[PDB]
Design a binder for this molecule. Sequence first.
Ligand SMILES: *[C@@H]1O[C@H](CO)[C@@H](O[C@@H]2O[C@H](CO)[C@@H](O[C@@H]3O[C@H](CO)[C@@H](O)[C@H](O)[C@@H]3O)[C@H](O)[C@H]2NC(C)=O)[C@H](O)[C@H]1NC(C)=O
Ligand SMILES: *[C@@H]1O[C@H](CO)[C@@H](O[C@@H]2O[C@H](CO)[C@@H](O[C@@H]3O[C@H](CO)[C@@H](O)[C@H](O)[C@@H]3O)[C@H](O)[C@H]2NC(C)=O)[C@H](O)[C@H]1NC(C)=O
Ligand SMILES: *[C@@H]1O[C@H](CO)[C@@H](O[C@@H]2O[C@H](CO)[C@@H](O)[C@H](O)[C@H]2NC(C)=O)[C@H](O)[C@H]1NC(C)=O
Ligand SMILES: *[C@@H]1O[C@H](CO)[C@@H](O[C@@H]2O[C@H](CO)[C@@H](O)[C@H](O)[C@H]2NC(C)=O)[C@H](O)[C@H]1NC(C)=O
Ligand SMILES: *[C@@H]1O[C@H](CO)[C@@H](O[C@@H]2O[C@H](CO)[C@@H](O)[C@H](O)[C@H]2NC(C)=O)[C@H](O)[C@H]1NC(C)=O
Ligand SMILES: *[C@@H]1O[C@H](CO)[C@@H](O[C@@H]2O[C@H](CO)[C@@H](O)[C@H](O)[C@H]2NC(C)=O)[C@H](O)[C@H]1NC(C)=O
Ligand SMILES: *[C@@H]1O[C@H](CO)[C@@H](O[C@@H]2O[C@H](CO)[C@@H](O)[C@H](O)[C@H]2NC(C)=O)[C@H](O)[C@H]1NC(C)=O
Ligand SMILES: *[C@@H]1O[C@H](CO)[C@@H](O[C@@H]2O[C@H](CO)[C@@H](O)[C@H](O)[C@H]2NC(C)=O)[C@H](O)[C@H]1NC(C)=O
Ligand SMILES: *[C@@H]1O[C@H](CO)[C@@H](O[C@@H]2O[C@H](CO)[C@@H](O)[C@H](O)[C@H]2NC(C)=O)[C@H](O)[C@H]1NC(C)=O
Ligand SMILES: *[C@@H]1O[C@H](CO)[C@@H](O[C@@H]2O[C@H](CO)[C@@H](O)[C@H](O)[C@H]2NC(C)=O)[C@H](O)[C@H]1NC(C)=O
Ligand SMILES: *[C@@H]1O[C@H](CO)[C@@H](O[C@@H]2O[C@H](CO)[C@@H](O)[C@H](O)[C@H]2NC(C)=O)[C@H](O)[C@H]1NC(C)=O
Ligand SMILES: *[C@@H]1O[C@H](CO)[C@@H](O[C@@H]2O[C@H](CO)[C@@H](O)[C@H](O)[C@H]2NC(C)=O)[C@H](O)[C@H]1NC(C)=O
Ligand SMILES: *[C@@H]1O[C@H](CO)[C@@H](O[C@@H]2O[C@H](CO)[C@@H](O)[C@H](O)[C@H]2NC(C)=O)[C@H](O)[C@H]1NC(C)=O
Ligand SMILES: *[C@@H]1O[C@H](CO)[C@@H](O[C@@H]2O[C@H](CO)[C@@H](O)[C@H](O)[C@H]2NC(C)=O)[C@H](O)[C@H]1NC(C)=O
Ligand SMILES: *[C@@H]1O[C@H](CO)[C@@H](O[C@@H]2O[C@H](CO)[C@@H](O)[C@H](O)[C@H]2NC(C)=O)[C@H](O)[C@H]1NC(C)=O
Ligand SMILES: *[C@@H]1O[C@H](CO)[C@@H](O[C@@H]2O[C@H](CO)[C@@H](O)[C@H](O)[C@H]2NC(C)=O)[C@H](O)[C@H]1NC(C)=O
Ligand SMILES: *[C@@H]1O[C@H](CO)[C@@H](O[C@@H]2O[C@H](CO)[C@@H](O)[C@H](O)[C@H]2NC(C)=O)[C@H](O)[C@H]1NC(C)=O
Ligand SMILES: *[C@@H]1O[C@H](CO)[C@@H](O[C@@H]2O[C@H](CO)[C@@H](O)[C@H](O)[C@H]2NC(C)=O)[C@H](O)[C@H]1NC(C)=O
Ligand SMILES: *[C@@H]1O[C@H](CO)[C@@H](O)[C@H](O)[C@H]1NC(C)=O
Ligand SMILES: *[C@@H]1O[C@H](CO)[C@@H](O)[C@H](O)[C@H]1NC(C)=O
Ligand SMILES: *[C@@H]1O[C@H](CO)[C@@H](O)[C@H](O)[C@H]1NC(C)=O
Ligand SMILES: *[C@@H]1O[C@H](CO)[C@@H](O)[C@H](O)[C@H]1NC(C)=O
Ligand SMILES: *[C@@H]1O[C@H](CO)[C@@H](O)[C@H](O)[C@H]1NC(C)=O
Ligand SMILES: *[C@@H]1O[C@H](CO)[C@@H](O)[C@H](O)[C@H]1NC(C)=O
Ligand SMILES: *[C@@H]1O[C@H](CO)[C@@H](O)[C@H](O)[C@H]1NC(C)=O
Ligand SMILES: *[C@@H]1O[C@H](CO)[C@@H](O)[C@H](O)[C@H]1NC(C)=O
Lengths: 126, 123, 126, 432, 440
Amino acid sequence: FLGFLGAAGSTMGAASMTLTVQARNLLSGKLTVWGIKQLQARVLAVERYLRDQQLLGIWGCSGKLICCTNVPWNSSWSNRNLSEIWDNMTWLQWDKEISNYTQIIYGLLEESQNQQEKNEQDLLAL
Amino acid sequence: FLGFLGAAGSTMGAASMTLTVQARNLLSGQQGIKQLQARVLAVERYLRDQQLLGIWGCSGKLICCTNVPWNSSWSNRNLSEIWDNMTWLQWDKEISNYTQIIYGLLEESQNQQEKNEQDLLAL
Amino acid sequence: FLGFLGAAGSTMGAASMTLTVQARNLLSGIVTVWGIKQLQARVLAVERYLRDQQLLGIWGCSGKLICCTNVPWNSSWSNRNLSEIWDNMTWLQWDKEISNYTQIIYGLLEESQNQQEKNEQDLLAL
Amino acid sequence: LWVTVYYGVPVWKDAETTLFCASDNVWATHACVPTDPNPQEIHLENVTEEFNMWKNNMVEQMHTDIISLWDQSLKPCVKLTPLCVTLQCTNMRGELKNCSFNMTTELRDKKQKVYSLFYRLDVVQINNKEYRLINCNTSACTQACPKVSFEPIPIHYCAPAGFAILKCKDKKFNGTGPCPSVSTVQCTHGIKPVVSTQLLLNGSLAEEEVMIRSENITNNAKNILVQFNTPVQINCTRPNNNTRKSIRIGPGQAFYATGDIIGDIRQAHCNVSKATWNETLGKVVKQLRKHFGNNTIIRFANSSGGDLEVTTHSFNCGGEFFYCNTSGLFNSTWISNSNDSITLPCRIKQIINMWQRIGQCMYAPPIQGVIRCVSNITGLILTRDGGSTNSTTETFRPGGGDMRDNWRSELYKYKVVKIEPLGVAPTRCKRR
Amino acid sequence: LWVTVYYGVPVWKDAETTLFCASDNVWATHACVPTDPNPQEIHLENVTEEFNMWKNNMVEQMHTDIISLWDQSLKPCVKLTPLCVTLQCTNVTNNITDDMRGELKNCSFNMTTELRDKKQKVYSLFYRLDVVQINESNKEYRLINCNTSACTQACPKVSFEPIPIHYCAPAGFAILKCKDKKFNGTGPCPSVSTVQCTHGIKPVVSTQLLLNGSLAEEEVMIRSENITNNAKNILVQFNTPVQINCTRPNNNTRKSIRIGPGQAFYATGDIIGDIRQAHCNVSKATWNETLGKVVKQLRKHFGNNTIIRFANSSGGDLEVTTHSFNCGGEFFYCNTSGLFNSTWISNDSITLPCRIKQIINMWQRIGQCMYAPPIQGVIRCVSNITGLILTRDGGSTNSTTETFRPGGGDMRDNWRSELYKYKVVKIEPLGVAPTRCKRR
Ligand SMILES: *[C@@H]1O[C@H](CO)[C@@H](O[C@@H]2O[C@H](CO)[C@@H](O[C@@H]3O[C@H](CO)[C@@H](O)[C@H](O)[C@@H]3O)[C@H](O)[C@H]2NC(C)=O)[C@H](O)[C@H]1NC(C)=O
Ligand SMILES: *[C@@H]1O[C@H](CO)[C@@H](O[C@@H]2O[C@H](CO)[C@@H](O[C@@H]3O[C@H](CO)[C@@H](O)[C@H](O)[C@@H]3O)[C@H](O)[C@H]2NC(C)=O)[C@H](O)[C@H]1NC(C)=O
Ligand SMILES: *[C@@H]1O[C@H](CO)[C@@H](O[C@@H]2O[C@H](CO)[C@@H](O)[C@H](O)[C@H]2NC(C)=O)[C@H](O)[C@H]1NC(C)=O
Ligand SMILES: *[C@@H]1O[C@H](CO)[C@@H](O[C@@H]2O[C@H](CO)[C@@H](O)[C@H](O)[C@H]2NC(C)=O)[C@H](O)[C@H]1NC(C)=O
Ligand SMILES: *[C@@H]1O[C@H](CO)[C@@H](O[C@@H]2O[C@H](CO)[C@@H](O)[C@H](O)[C@H]2NC(C)=O)[C@H](O)[C@H]1NC(C)=O
Ligand SMILES: *[C@@H]1O[C@H](CO)[C@@H](O[C@@H]2O[C@H](CO)[C@@H](O)[C@H](O)[C@H]2NC(C)=O)[C@H](O)[C@H]1NC(C)=O
Ligand SMILES: *[C@@H]1O[C@H](CO)[C@@H](O[C@@H]2O[C@H](CO)[C@@H](O)[C@H](O)[C@H]2NC(C)=O)[C@H](O)[C@H]1NC(C)=O
Ligand SMILES: *[C@@H]1O[C@H](CO)[C@@H](O[C@@H]2O[C@H](CO)[C@@H](O)[C@H](O)[C@H]2NC(C)=O)[C@H](O)[C@H]1NC(C)=O
Ligand SMILES: *[C@@H]1O[C@H](CO)[C@@H](O[C@@H]2O[C@H](CO)[C@@H](O)[C@H](O)[C@H]2NC(C)=O)[C@H](O)[C@H]1NC(C)=O
Ligand SMILES: *[C@@H]1O[C@H](CO)[C@@H](O[C@@H]2O[C@H](CO)[C@@H](O)[C@H](O)[C@H]2NC(C)=O)[C@H](O)[C@H]1NC(C)=O
Ligand SMILES: *[C@@H]1O[C@H](CO)[C@@H](O[C@@H]2O[C@H](CO)[C@@H](O)[C@H](O)[C@H]2NC(C)=O)[C@H](O)[C@H]1NC(C)=O
Ligand SMILES: *[C@@H]1O[C@H](CO)[C@@H](O[C@@H]2O[C@H](CO)[C@@H](O)[C@H](O)[C@H]2NC(C)=O)[C@H](O)[C@H]1NC(C)=O
Ligand SMILES: *[C@@H]1O[C@H](CO)[C@@H](O[C@@H]2O[C@H](CO)[C@@H](O)[C@H](O)[C@H]2NC(C)=O)[C@H](O)[C@H]1NC(C)=O
Ligand SMILES: *[C@@H]1O[C@H](CO)[C@@H](O[C@@H]2O[C@H](CO)[C@@H](O)[C@H](O)[C@H]2NC(C)=O)[C@H](O)[C@H]1NC(C)=O
Ligand SMILES: *[C@@H]1O[C@H](CO)[C@@H](O[C@@H]2O[C@H](CO)[C@@H](O)[C@H](O)[C@H]2NC(C)=O)[C@H](O)[C@H]1NC(C)=O
Ligand SMILES: *[C@@H]1O[C@H](CO)[C@@H](O[C@@H]2O[C@H](CO)[C@@H](O)[C@H](O)[C@H]2NC(C)=O)[C@H](O)[C@H]1NC(C)=O
Ligand SMILES: *[C@@H]1O[C@H](CO)[C@@H](O[C@@H]2O[C@H](CO)[C@@H](O)[C@H](O)[C@H]2NC(C)=O)[C@H](O)[C@H]1NC(C)=O
Ligand SMILES: *[C@@H]1O[C@H](CO)[C@@H](O[C@@H]2O[C@H](CO)[C@@H](O)[C@H](O)[C@H]2NC(C)=O)[C@H](O)[C@H]1NC(C)=O
Ligand SMILES: *[C@@H]1O[C@H](CO)[C@@H](O)[C@H](O)[C@H]1NC(C)=O
Ligand SMILES: *[C@@H]1O[C@H](CO)[C@@H](O)[C@H](O)[C@H]1NC(C)=O
Ligand SMILES: *[C@@H]1O[C@H](CO)[C@@H](O)[C@H](O)[C@H]1NC(C)=O
Ligand SMILES: *[C@@H]1O[C@H](CO)[C@@H](O)[C@H](O)[C@H]1NC(C)=O
Ligand SMILES: *[C@@H]1O[C@H](CO)[C@@H](O)[C@H](O)[C@H]1NC(C)=O
Ligand SMILES: *[C@@H]1O[C@H](CO)[C@@H](O)[C@H](O)[C@H]1NC(C)=O
Ligand SMILES: *[C@@H]1O[C@H](CO)[C@@H](O)[C@H](O)[C@H]1NC(C)=O
Ligand SMILES: *[C@@H]1O[C@H](CO)[C@@H](O)[C@H](O)[C@H]1NC(C)=O
């Protein structure tokens, strides 16, 4: 047990096993100067948790940490293979590499889930 | 692309394909005490709707199908007329009543479904 | 209809069919010096409900009131019968007799869900 | 058919909520968050929504916010409680009084004898050569701080999360009733909190015609808002070359009085061009004959109020509060068949009770030099004198009083709604 | 390959937030969150993080917090409005030791009574730095700031003694600590460890000598934003503390004068014994070795053959050119011109005279002050000199000598020597990755 955020130096294949310890320590895990701003910080933390939970729920990955989608991986985003991404890079190095192409993926996932829900509703009628 | 409320005048057949642009614009945003109380009210209003979706078993999805049969006393009209010649505002103006009883039958139907699933998995 | 919190004297079988009238009231139950008091009360209630929902979603039981888990019962926390638990016991005595050994279960469910997610992940690669 | 639950449907309901300010002095630009550089305006097609300018809760929140941001900028300012003393006062003509009086000093042991130039509208006789300030039975005035400005700045009222603001875009809208050109908006346009009476200075103009808006035309107890399509320019003078001197009361507290006036003493006045105000009243009469008949004789009278703020056109030019006698403007009769200007004499008051709150006044410090207006008359607040069910003549007099009708001429196309994104619908599909 | 969404990845970005405080007075400790003793600090193994002590938001937030908790503790205290009178002052010539001569003034004045229609004639002993003559055996004087404002008397039941505070972080944010022993403030760090909250930073107010506080580990550390620019201060951190000993030998007396209903003004009475000036003592040999180590560290940056010189301050006001601190509730002003007087070619004691003020204008705010009430009895003081603030006189691109003078002024550099090892980051738990797996 390394602790909170202690797997940041390890590779992303080994840091993918400890998502619960990072996910658990979010969401909390005038008469005085220290009164208003701590309430504002708590409300900001609640909002920042709820926006990420909504963004997970739009893609259809609600209630789970590792979610498999059906969007193919474009070669323009990266050209590295699976043998060295998960065994030579960390999450911090990987985040700086696909930072310019995250909105395209964030739109493709929600359009794929909307198409999947439409196809499910069309299939359940027959 | 229409916008935040661009499908508010079109038919409900075409307005049901853009439910993402109204779902995502409910928390922080093309939408001291006055900031904070409004933010807390918005968070609570989002959480009440999320809880209401979670009780019926429709959690995590925008479009869901249920087992509650459609009573003819609520509305007696064609499927190809409701979904192609009406608007969500007009449809909400028709069924302003009978919403609470529909919510109650959805909740109790999910309760019977959950207890039947528990009885099936008990074997 | 026993109303809200009205099944506290009943047995577990009678009180397991009425969790919806409790779970509706854990979020909200309402329609100068009283402003910041109500504000911090609402913030605390929202934080507690979100923490409970996150703790349910970690174990893999999001969106459900009753869920089953692959971890077994050691028969040491409570070695007594199934019949006298669900027909001759209330929830309060159960909490008072199990709350000694409830923090080891809360990691067992988490590690079971963490094993289940990686099993589902490498099962889908075939 | 089975019930299907849809989340995120575009359904709205009428609601009341708090609206937060945004902008890009006494009007706090610090508290207001910065707005986006470019706004977003979605044109909602096939939408007809019913508006009502006379019963929206966007002007009642605005009035409270104007009061709140007004009275929190006079909190670090000096309280003029030592100045309710006996004033020994000597003498256009009779407006100014030279008053000499005792005053304290920074040192609590010594005293000074000072003098100032007060107005006749600010002092009252104790019962001659024996005067006091007019407020010194009710409250001590709080002197306005001489660095904060009274210039109005545009503030946009943005909606919170989960709500929406529906602008109407019809060019013939009369305030009440269905608008078929409804488009949502992120935030409202720049609304300047300009306080005025009998004329709407520095406001938004109509696009096509002069618009007459009233809650009930037939009832004569309702004010009439007239909106122009072209502006009328007004220019002012305060020709007295005033000098300001700082009589220092105590430790860190000063009272900015009026010193000697260099040169002659002349009354303040401000001018309206005759060739525009004529046929501006013609457009007003032409648009007023559509509600009262084609053959009525439309008349105008000057005023019938009792208060100085109601009788005279009250506004704030350059820092000084003017009360202009608009009697040559509203003097005409209209029967259905090039450089001259109308000069309006104005009076200047220094003790100001603005929002008609009992027990709260404010002293305005003098401004050095000459003060000039330049402003657009973009509306009128008229009031009809009734009397007959079948009248062949109608008399219209300027009104005022409540300041909520000043901001109701700007928040007339806006409406705040809440979103109710939860629907149930019959569909031929069931859950496995 | 398909897109796979992971929630809870260890990814952070640099951000800012409102850090709340915790603790184990004017620093409002009673309303702070209690601190739980726990293993709060863990080590991050294979990480390097870029730190910057000069672009940190935490010190700029701590300055605002210290100001906001300073000016709210003076609200339930009496305001000295009616003290702005004319004082008839006389020289005191009782047991004067020829050094504190003309410093103390015996001033009598009229004062208000708790009954509104009565007056009293009282007297008090003021300092020379608090009175200003108005008529340019007795002369008329006035308080130095009654032309500008009215001072607020500090309440005797609150103390200005600093106690340690801890700065926690809210949810979604983390605090990273630099554990490098040779860190110079700016640059990459290979030993980064996350922590729940900072250590106990004591808000000690000083201008030239960083009294109390934390020390370095290995050697004397020299830190600057730009070591070639002479317009930026140099922070020197010691590895061994230098003990300094304050004193005030005057046995003062405090007497209350009722200036209203329930309001008292604490004036200075007579002095029992002789009147001697206050001073500070420091060891000569320890200061000599400490300045030798400082010279040896400064020769690493400024050439290995240059002549390092130390000369006294060149400020304008008393808060800059004179070492100011607070001990026992009394505010001192130490001449410290015997400390910085040396040149360095490649059991005695130093006694430094002091002066005492009572009209204090702290944080350099316009129109706000504070009156410090007198303290009965003698005042003792033991403190640790654990750092310096220096300013370099540069008048040549290449030179064989350098002159360093004591600095001061801004109080932000006092707390920048404690939060140099800390930074705050925002955790972003979402991520996407390519994996050979697809949804059904
Ligand atoms: C609106 O306009 C009318 C006239 O069109 C104004 O009424 C006039 O008011 C003045 C001064 O208030 C009166 O003058 C006084 O009259 C008598 C003459 O016997 C005398 O006591 C004084 O020496 C003084 O001159 C004037 O008579 C009066 N005119 C009429 C026809 O009644 C009225 O003041 C205006 N209302 C406003 C500005 O609210
Ligand atoms: C640096 O830290 C030292 C150690 O804490 C500080 O010295 C301490 O200062 C306080 C406040 O003046 C002294 O407390 C007072 O002492 C006497 C004896 O009890 C009495 O007047 C009061 O009851 C109160 O307790 C304390 O004795 C003193 N410690 C020592 C060992 O002398 C020092 O002030 C700090 N330097 C600063 C803030 O510049
Ligand atoms: C607004 O109403 C118009 C007019 O009914 C709609 O336009 C028609 O939409 C149908 C359904 O897609 C098409 O088959 C027709 O060709 C359209 N045109 C005409 C002239 O009938 C329109 O869809 C509505 N909604 C909007 C713009 O959002
Ligand atoms: C409260 O306790 C009483 C008494 O035990 C319960 O009534 C009966 O309890 C027995 C078991 O002791 C059950 O077998 C019966 O079904 C119960 N009912 C009847 C009508 O005999 C009772 O259920 C408990 N709860 C409440 C809410 O009253
Ligand atoms: C207002 O009255 C004051 C006296 O209270 C006038 O001040 C005096 O003016 C005369 C004539 O210029 C001077 O000789 C005196 O020295 C002035 N006395 C003081 C005490 O200043 C003042 O001029 C009057 N102001 C007017 C009439 O505008
Ligand atoms: C300013 O104060 C002075 C000093 O008291 C006033 O001068 C006296 O006023 C009283 C009023 O009762 C007279 O009886 C005295 O004759 C005045 N002179 C003296 C020398 O005492 C003066 O009136 C005050 N100024 C005002 C009220 O404008
Ligand atoms: C008074 O009205 C005139 C005429 O409408 C205003 O002048 C216009 O100002 C707008 C500002 O966006 C410009 O886009 C127009 O080109 C101007 N028109 C002309 C003809 O100059 C003027 O700004 C108004 N004055 C005030 C103080 O509001
Ligand atoms: C607008 O005002 C007119 C005139 O006062 C109102 O008409 C009167 O209505 C009352 C009842 O409210 C009747 O007793 C009167 O006989 C009516 N008078 C006339 C001249 O018709 C009218 O009701 C008002 N409009 C609204 C919508 O209230
Ligand atoms: C308002 O108009 C009047 C004339 O109708 C202007 O008064 C004239 O001002 C000029 C400039 O000083 C003088 O030369 C004239 O003698 C004045 N005329 C009269 C009849 O007195 C006045 O200046 C205008 N006010 C403005 C533009 O603010
Ligand atoms: C009001 O009076 C002042 C003081 O007499 C005038 O200020 C003078 O202005 C002229 C012209 O700019 C300068 O040359 C002088 O140096 C100023 N001072 C003095 C003491 O004469 C001011 O211009 C006047 N205002 C107006 C509008 O005429
Ligand atoms: C109000 O003032 C403006 C200037 O501030 C006047 O406009 C001037 O009008 C004259 C006469 O036509 C022109 O020669 C000038 O070029 C104009 N100046 C500007 C800057 O446009 C305007 O006439 C005045 N209005 C009145 C007195 O009603
Ligand atoms: C407002 O102005 C009008 C005219 O501009 C004033 O009416 C004049 O008042 C004087 C007062 O001495 C009379 O002599 C005139 O005969 C009036 N003129 C007319 C045409 O009736 C009116 O008094 C002003 N209002 C005030 C000062 O309150
Ligand atoms: C980064 O540091 C981590 C520490 O968590 C290294 O992980 C282990 O390092 C030891 C040290 O020799 C090796 O024996 C292990 O095999 C490593 N574990 C693995 C690879 O799962 C990690 O190797 C370091 N990274 C680099 C590039 O040196
Ligand atoms: C640190 O200080 C040096 C020395 O003053 C700065 O270098 C100067 O940069 C300016 C701007 O280009 C040049 O005009 C000077 O000639 C430079 N001086 C020398 C001695 O080279 C430098 O910019 C500062 N900042 C950093 C980040 O190094
Ligand atoms: C600082 O040191 C000086 C000596 O360097 C001390 O002064 C002596 O104090 C003792 C009593 O402690 C007297 O007997 C001596 O006569 C004093 N000597 C001189 C030369 O004045 C002084 O007390 C010390 N101050 C402290 C420790 O606060
Ligand atoms: C400072 O002066 C005070 C007051 O004079 C001294 O207090 C002594 O206190 C005792 C009881 O504690 C009394 O019996 C004595 O009479 C007091 N002595 C004198 C000389 O007044 C206190 O000791 C003095 N402090 C010193 C000398 O350090
Ligand atoms: C300050 O001055 C006052 C008088 O203004 C002095 O008080 C006098 O002290 C002497 C000597 O003990 C007594 O005889 C007198 O009765 C006192 N007069 C009073 C109380 O009105 C006081 O001692 C001086 N303080 C010093 C020199 O420190
Ligand atoms: C500062 O004062 C302290 C006392 O607080 C001195 O420390 C003592 O010094 C004496 C004399 O050498 C030793 O016998 C003691 O062992 C020391 N410690 C204690 C705890 O009493 C210290 O020497 C003084 N420092 C200076 C520089 O004068
Ligand atoms: C079950 O867990 C308890 C925890 O106290 C332990 O004592 C017991 O041995 C466990 N039982 C089995 C069968 O592993
Ligand atoms: C409960 O389990 C015990 C285990 O020894 C058994 O003897 C007993 O019959 C069971 N049933 C009841 C009703 O006690
Ligand atoms: C003097 O002041 C009085 C105050 O009542 C005023 O009536 C009068 O006109 C003034 N002028 C003269 C010359 O009397
Ligand atoms: C209108 O104004 C003129 C000129 O100022 C004046 O003589 C006339 O009396 C006014 N009209 C009325 C009806 O008062
Ligand atoms: C104190 O003595 C000095 C030196 O003689 C003298 O200049 C000063 O005026 C005296 N102060 C007084 C009398 O207040
Ligand atoms: C601090 O260290 C970094 C990294 O070695 C270096 O680039 C920088 O110049 C140093 N700054 C000072 C002031 O010594
Ligand atoms: C300063 O140092 C010089 C020698 O560098 C010495 O002669 C002089 O006395 C010193 N002055 C003080 C005040 O210590
Ligand atoms: C000074 O430093 C020493 C050694 O680190 C420490 O024990 C002591 O508490 C410090 N403070 C004092 C004497 O006030």
